[PDB]
Symmetry: C3
Subunit: 333 residues, 3 copies
């Protein structure tokens, strides 16, 4: 009887950060209430000023990470304000039935809906918009995010022993297909609807023009680098709603990796690089052992360094010369 379960409302936070939560569940099953507002908005995605009409959950690309525990009920209030122009909905890969909820959550501008589903399988899952007849357009305009369903007793390693993270970050990776003129310059449009016919032709080339973390080239660099300290245990959740990616921590590893993101499976150990298939969320666990700057990249290095799929970690702490040292610094022969 759901009417008698505890309820908690959770306010979401913008990626790459994650709303507060417990790793090991301290309560029994609950109804966890979320609210998301759809926002169509102009987004500048690179240094040259290329702009697109993004379709977002809660104003960000990716949408925010939701965190619940196995056999909680997720109750999502989805709002499509009348300032938007398109029909939207939501499909949870975590949910069972009605096309992940997409068949029940179709909202025109000016409408809202509330969906409830039981989170019966633990793991990280993609959620995304999927309206009849324009599914890839909405997904590749940034309308996707992820939900994490933790086991009620938290994460465990390949031997059943507890894994506790000190920090969690959510990296949503987005392939964009910006239409081009004949010389190769990017086009701009006044409304999403104006872009639609060109967007379909741009998608059919299967060649992204940009592949970005957190909605823009360089979004997770500089002042916006992810932070940690030597000795801290970090969980990196990574989603790609449409296209394969192969994350890699330059200078580190994935100590424990759920490449396809499902926690009833044992993790893969000591990964240098792992494949997250398009339409999947994965998670990697790493304990930092050296300070300094790390890059976190899609290890198709063209996609990383030419098309935008690269971010930074800045890690504080003491350098360990046993793990690595420069014996002879670069010098002339």
């Amino acid at each position: 009887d759901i009417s008698t379960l505890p309820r908690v409302k959770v306010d979401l936070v913008k990626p790459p950060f994650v709303h507060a939560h417990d790793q090991v569940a301290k309560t029994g099953p609950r109804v966890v209430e979320f609210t998301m507002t759809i926002e169509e908005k102009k987004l500048v995605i690179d240094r040259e000023g290329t702009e697109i009409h993004a379709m977002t959950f809660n104003g960000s690309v990716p949408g925010p990470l939701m965190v619940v525990h196995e056999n909680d009920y997720v109750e999502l209030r989805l709002i499509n304000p009348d300032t938007n122009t398109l029909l939207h909905n939501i499909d949870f890969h975590a949910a069972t039935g009605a096309l992940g909820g997409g068949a029940l959550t179709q909202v025109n501008p000016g409408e809202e809906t509330t969906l409830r589903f039981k989170a019966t399988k633990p793991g990280v899952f993609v959620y995304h918009c999927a309206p009849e007849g324009m599914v890839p357009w909405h997904v590749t305009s940034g309308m996707n995010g992820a939900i994490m369903v933790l086991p009620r007793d938290g994460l465990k390693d390949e031997k059943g022993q507890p894994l506790t993270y000190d920090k969690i970050y959510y990296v949503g990776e987005q392939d964009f297909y910006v239409p081009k003129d004949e010389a190769g310059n990017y086009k701009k449009y006044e409304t999403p609807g104006e872009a639609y016919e060109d967007a379909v032709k741009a998608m059919r080339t299967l060649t992204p023009t940009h592949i970005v973390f957190n909605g823009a080239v360089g979004a997770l660099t500089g002042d916006h680098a992810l932070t940690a300290a030597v000795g801290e245990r970090v969980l990196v959740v990574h989603s790609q709603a449409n296209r394969d990616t192969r994350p890699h921590l330059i200078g580190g590893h994935g100590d424990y990796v759920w490449a396809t993101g499902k926690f009833r499976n044992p993790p893969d150990l000591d990964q240098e690089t792992w494949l997250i298939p398009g339409g999947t969320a994965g998670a990697a666990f790493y304990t930092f052992r050296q300070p300094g700057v790390y890059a976190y990249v899609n290890h198709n290095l063209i996609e990383a360094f030419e098309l935008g799929a690269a971010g930074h970690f800045k890690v504080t702490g003491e350098w360990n010369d046993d793990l690595m040292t420069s014996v002879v610094k670069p010098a002339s022969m």
Copy 2:
């Protein structure tokens, strides 16, 4: 001594259906006899009437699924009628030696051959045509299928316990590279040989024009949807002879997944999406828990909804409001 083993002839059925078989072997090892006839034929692959010269095993794209048990002998009679125009052969990824049998089964039009091999490894495997110097042309013209080698005691879960399916379907996914004129219209040809020079240039772009299930856009939709009922256990075998795919059941999961298709390995649990590498067959096991329409897609959603890699399941039964319910139906604010 093979001369003293029992023999059974099996008549194949057209995909997505699968010929009758036992999951748990009731006999000892047998010689299982199959006959396949090669057919080159014109195929209409989309709604706009695009036609190609398909090269098929037994008249279908994909070729039919063969089912045997571990350490059976597969005896294939391969017939190339004199109405065809090209040399053909067959390479079983399930077989050991002679390029999977391709070096022993080269038949010109008007010829036949009989190959026997021992099915020493359990799993689902690709088979495909592979003639010297024109391997990708034949494969990407649809000349590929799959063979399933069940363990003699049937499928088992990650804990060694029996898994029994009530229904099995075979989805063969095909990337096509149809040559285009300079405006982007598809070309048509009178014979396969006329197409050859353009086909090689179309393949070298590495960009498919169509990606389809069961040989055509929409082949597994509408009246041809796959069917099941709530409570039924379904095994979906999926093959891709040439290109990576990432299947996903919209509204469901892969409860047990052998993404690279080899049954001596434990399955991956609770997958939302899984990667089947080009040149591989995989299998997913799911128990339907909600009725309604499901879509089964390659979760590069451009490949699914723009290029053709999408099919339907229609599932009967009672809706379970505990798993999912619309609390507030879409309404105006």
Copy 3:
């Protein structure tokens, strides 16, 4: 205290061969000393005479395979002779900190450096050049290789039992992006620097012009086929620093496969084809059971047979008619 550990200098050998080593460690941890010399050189990569300016470690594409054991120290002396024209460095995916060593090993022409790192995780790992601002250019010009970190007690199967190989081969797979004129002919350049601006535009198409084993179309065919005998146990190490690949032994299998290359994980059994993500090294173990010619391919068959990713094994021994036999040789009906 490193000053008191034994030291051994190892001279590297050209791929596909591997320098002599012990599978089970016979000594305690050691400092293993390697020397590599960078060589920028013109390379002919196909039958039509297409030439590129390769950037190599030790004069080969890929760079040589280094073999050490877990918790050895790797001490690399890296030399950039003054006959080269570009800055180079090295990033070991096996190493922890300083961008895998890339931040510590930047050498201009005429400089050298010596890096030491502890090999704390067993597996096969990529190493590659990665200079600030031109990472994919150097990697896709061939400046990548692999290092194998064996467990001190050797390789083990999925049940913990010893796996011993008789032969080991290293196949480095390289995607090249050769710039083209408007008719599609490949361009040639006098120096690497002349090529740079066109190379970036060629890479951004994400479409390789060539995909080769051991630096050239046909490099591992003919007289340069890999060799083995029936009954021999062969380990094939395969790396791809930039792009996914899906290796397949035509006529064989991967009996034990570490597709993402990390030996603390149990191997996948009986693979027909396996996915090595871009930026990863994998390893497959196979016992040959039939003599004859085998092809070893990337099983995107367009990439294999049109773009160059195919090599040969020639295996001696006695044919086993129990595994495969031609019952009726190809004959006219």
